[PDB]
Symmetry: D2
Subunit: 388 residues, 4 copies
Amino acid sequence: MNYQPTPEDRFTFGLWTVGWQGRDPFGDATRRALDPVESVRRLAELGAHGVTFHDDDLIPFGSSDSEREEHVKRFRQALDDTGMKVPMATTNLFTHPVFKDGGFTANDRDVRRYALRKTIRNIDLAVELGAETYVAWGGREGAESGGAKDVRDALDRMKEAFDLLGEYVTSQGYDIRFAIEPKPNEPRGDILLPTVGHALAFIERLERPELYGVNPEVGHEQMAGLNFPHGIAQALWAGKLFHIDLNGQNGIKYDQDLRFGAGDLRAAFWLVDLLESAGYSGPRHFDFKPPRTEDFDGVWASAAGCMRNYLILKERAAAFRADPEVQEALRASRLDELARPTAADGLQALLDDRSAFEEFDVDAAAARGMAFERLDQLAMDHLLGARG
Amino acid sequence: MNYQPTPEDRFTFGLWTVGWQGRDPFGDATRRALDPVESVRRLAELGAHGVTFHDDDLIPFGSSDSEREEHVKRFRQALDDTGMKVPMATTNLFTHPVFKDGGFTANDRDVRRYALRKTIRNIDLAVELGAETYVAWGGREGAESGGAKDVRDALDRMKEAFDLLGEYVTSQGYDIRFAIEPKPNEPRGDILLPTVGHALAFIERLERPELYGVNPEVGHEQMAGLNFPHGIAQALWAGKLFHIDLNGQNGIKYDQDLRFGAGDLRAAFWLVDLLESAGYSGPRHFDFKPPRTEDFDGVWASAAGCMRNYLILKERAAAFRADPEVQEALRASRLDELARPTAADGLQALLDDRSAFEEFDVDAAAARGMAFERLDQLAMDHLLGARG
Amino acid sequence: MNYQPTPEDRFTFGLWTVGWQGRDPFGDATRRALDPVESVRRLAELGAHGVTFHDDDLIPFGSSDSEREEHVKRFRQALDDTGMKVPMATTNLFTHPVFKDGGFTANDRDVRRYALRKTIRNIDLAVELGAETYVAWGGREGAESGGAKDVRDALDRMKEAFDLLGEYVTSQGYDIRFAIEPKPNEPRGDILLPTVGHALAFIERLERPELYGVNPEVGHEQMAGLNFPHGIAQALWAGKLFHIDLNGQNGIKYDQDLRFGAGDLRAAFWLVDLLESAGYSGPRHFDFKPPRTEDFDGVWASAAGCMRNYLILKERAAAFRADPEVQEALRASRLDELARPTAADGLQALLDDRSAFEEFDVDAAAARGMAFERLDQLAMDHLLGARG
Amino acid sequence: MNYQPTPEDRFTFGLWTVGWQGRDPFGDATRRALDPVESVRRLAELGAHGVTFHDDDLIPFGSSDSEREEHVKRFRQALDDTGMKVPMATTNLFTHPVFKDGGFTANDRDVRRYALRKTIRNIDLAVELGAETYVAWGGREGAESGGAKDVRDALDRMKEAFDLLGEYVTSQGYDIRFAIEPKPNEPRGDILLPTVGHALAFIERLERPELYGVNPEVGHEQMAGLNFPHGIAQALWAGKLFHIDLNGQNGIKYDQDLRFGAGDLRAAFWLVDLLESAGYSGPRHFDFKPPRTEDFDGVWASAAGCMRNYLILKERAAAFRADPEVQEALRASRLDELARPTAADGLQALLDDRSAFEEFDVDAAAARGMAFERLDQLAMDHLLGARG
Ligand SMILES: OC[C@H]1O[C@H](O)[C@H](O)[C@@H](O)[C@@H]1O
Ligand SMILES: OC[C@H]1O[C@H](O)[C@H](O)[C@@H](O)[C@@H]1O
Ligand SMILES: OC[C@H]1O[C@H](O)[C@H](O)[C@@H](O)[C@@H]1O
Ligand SMILES: OC[C@H]1O[C@H](O)[C@H](O)[C@@H](O)[C@@H]1O
């Protein structure tokens, strides 16, 4: 009867989430900047396992090698004081005006080289802090108009960039993998590699595909009206779910980054059911923005809400799968048959099987109800805790 | 000053397009059925190069081997009489009630085996008629609720199915490739392999990836709010654009299948520019539905409109790229630099290049305007034929 | 601990809902036609209060005055046998090919006159069966292309039609009101009066506005990405919520008509909370389609699910509002202040109030957190039955 | 053969459009602030008729009565030097953190009173500068979660606010009307009065409805997937199109504010055709944002592009309507009949007209094609300048 998170739950937060000051396209900040050290302390008290960062969240852009050292030192001391881990790090290749046309796929060659150098420097830092995953979100890679970007040339530049980071990591002997985070649009009119599918496809064209996977975000796939759990299943099927960003989103519109559980509640249930049943072992990272209507107390309530909502859904999904009535319904809907090979007997035997065509009774097969509605209502009852 | 199509333009139409009777989810047919032989004659007169078909368009479901022979014979004679070709064929694995839960990924194993046998039979027919591409549109593969389909098991069944068709084609020595046509939703709540990206990713997991590519449709990618030309560029970059379905769609809503040129006009311009500049050599296939408000005369006007709109855009795109002012603008926006390697000098030289980081002037770089708006207005002027 | 519906709950269903045969734009029917008398019996056993119908659901198109009489007689006897009521009726001005360009706004004048006569005949029938509300869903009023419909002239024809039905009802002394059901698109490219707002605005231009209100549908407003509860609040505020259609919809895509509770679960919670708190006293009508994957047993399970889901949400919303912790949170977020007039003191006093401008401390006001996230998590806890 | 705008064309721009510095939710400004006086000079040279402003664009928030006077004086002198007019003004009730929960519908009563006082002060300024229209865009009126805002109470507060501004304007004897600008979402999760329809409906509940109309924006209606020209026709039909915001938007996603003509090109054509045929006489105001990739030269090219694109479409629409072949097609599609009353003979005569029902030949009527596709292709040919 308790939903208290503990570090063993592997809940993580970006510094930029609880640290979001509330500046939006139409308004000024509503909260003061949070010292990352304070963020780490508050999060550890809430039961979090660790934090993530962009280089620019930790070390202000333009810091001298000296101030940099100082900023890392204070951070490192907060991690030691709290026991918090840093499992993932990423680069800010979107805020500074130089990246207005992108980082790895900017038309200007000198900016692409700078983007790489900036990233490489942060990869060194990430390894030192113990991160296992390095995320790349190409927020500025894309266009508002068609002639501004030749997409085939942009994809060559993107592959070139990732191949170089792969050569770097391998030459240094680092134990770290990359994860590409898709987003369909915003802040560019259209962004390259807009969905999980596009990113997965792109990865197979890299020189060392085994080094790269995806970091899908609930809200981003939903901005394209796609089914998030289905996209995650395809990533898992491919062996490419290296990390995940959890949050909420209310349909096709701007990127909301609501707390996890908010937005599409049923999709959140099916997502938890899948992550737990597939045995996803990575961090449960929250990339959310406490709404700008909130003061600091609302910020911490929002973060606690993300973890609470995950734990409640995990309990409901587990009760759903453990329910014998549900196991019976799953067999009535033939989920058991879906998992059996269609033709382990082989092509030849299938061609010779008259029961597969010549003598197949299509009419009888057609008449068989799938019983999906009863199964779905059983799932609803479990979610709402209304199971008899 | 003429936009008359000729067979050399490679325009093709599905029998189900001009033959659509007008039955929609809320109303009865508004037109009588068209005899495929008549469809072939009318289309040849309009300047079309050929037609495509689903098995069930040509041979009514349940035909005896005898009537089948008769139907193919009459069709074949119309093709000989007109010189029309059949470059693509596909299977109907969606109309009959047996496929209500899918064909290759139905939960019922007996239906999956039947779907394969039905497909294999039509592949034999396709080769005989000279088709080079066999399209697969999994319209019924998917779900309306989360527990009805374990997506990892469904993907195993889908791969199993495609691998078997690949074994079949290779064992028979057929010269024919497969093309997967994505669609995000409708008629299922969510469809598997919902976008070009998801289909491309899936293909890399097949046993003989070289046999499969995609058959993207303008309207389907737009039902997910995605940029069609960008998706096509990624397919071309991957060497997987085996075929394409051209039509129009007005945003995120039901699958409209408006005539090509209708819907998002600018995207149609950028798509034509890309297909012609990349030297796409396959058919320009139209998968459209003449609206049910039309009589047969409106059906033929609609089909002629598809071809006319492609020819007009082709002329405008070619004039755009040939314009010296445009070539000058493209250099001002650094499209030339986008096409140059970021670091052909190699990783080591990039790491040692102080001009790439230590001494890079971010401020100067940032201040450089991209000149994208002038370029885009030049494109607009060309499209509207308002170029001085 | 029980969610059994009873006729006092005022749950109603259209004959076309449980009677949907499963024909969609890409497939044939998967279920046989249901005799309306059977539908009435099954629904009464489930705990329903009554049914609704389009003329064509009850009396097949083209029936002789004789067969018509017979069909009404059998229906009437089923209502007497079960105690079921008929609180609403409507016209089918969309299925028959004549209505391909609309009914009240068809370009052909002779069809508009026929649409009116067909409607008037059914209004007489509705009154006789005791219906209090007559719904109008202009599914075919609209266009796929811009020049096909002059919208100002179409609105004149629509107003003319409604004004005539108003004159008819008033001249006959009937006790019956009209309700306009909006839908943004499908089966037309764009439909006239696409949302609740457009319909409300249109009503104020009718000759006797007091005779007309709206019949909003959950899924239709969601097809435009709008907030359904907000739209319902505006209808209630205007005194125009005469009836309502409950169902589920998963975002911006084709009209799904999933069972109530499916789709956006949180919106369903907030909708129930609003209907119950505002004391909506009309029918709780379900306009849903049991998915075509189901057999008759799944049809009845789906219908029972609609009612169950409403009763569960009603219990959760009532517990939310009754919770003292929630009442405390509502005051912390100043919902109490929202309900107080901004300036009951009047314009002059506001202009002279220095505390309203000259001496207003914007900074202090700005710093006040709204506490919305804690309130929302309290709502989530109540919905999931996880309230301590 | 010329598309040069002149002040007689009535093209206007907001100071915040060409003055947009490029700050977005993910990045810093890419351009320096423009002095409003400079903006006025550059725009007059481009052929603009005038400018619009929010109070805070002209007078920086918190200015002393003294600096205010100075800022107005410099502005006024630029208008005199150039002959530029100021036909519309509006209030910034969204940037400052105090308005984080709204202005007129903030839960805090003290903020609602402040919002009114701030608005009233700017109305006085607007009249002095000669503005005929005062626009209200409630960007912060709304919510991210359901319990945060009781929408019926919010609508009472909104009506109360507008009624007070109406009392103020009437008591001062000012010649100025209000225009409500709808937007469905962003920066709030859902905004109140989300579409043209909702705003029109709301206006009929105000004390003096004749004082208020709408200021629809192309992109905002498109963020809800609605047909902009249709929404504008309904506004014109109601006599409520007081002003309009022109721009471009690519579908359902964040508010792009692309230059007019960009986005949905065909909708822009149909919009121009409607404004010119209905004789809309108000300003053609552009609310756009030159993309942040641009430098100042791209800013001015973008603004010139807005005007050019309107003039080109105006020429094409006029040629379309003047074409005798098009006038012939319009009669073939029965646009002439749409404009004729359905029953000027009256209810009684319609009831007695057997040709309207008893003897109506539905089959013959049904068989009549609408000829909409040929008409639409004629429109396309005209738009692309491909008319023989
Ligand atoms: O990839 C690193 C992070 O960068 C930015 O914060 C993006 O907004 C976020 O979605 C992404 O997760
Ligand atoms: O793939 C074959 C064809 O099957 C159906 O006709 C689909 O509606 C169409 O989009 C697809 O192209
Ligand atoms: O208005 C009567 C009914 O007609 C049709 O069944 C529409 O699909 C439904 O949404 C509407 O409620
Ligand atoms: O209403 C005044 C203006 O305020 C803001 O600039 C909005 O972003 C814009 O859409 C609106 O037109």
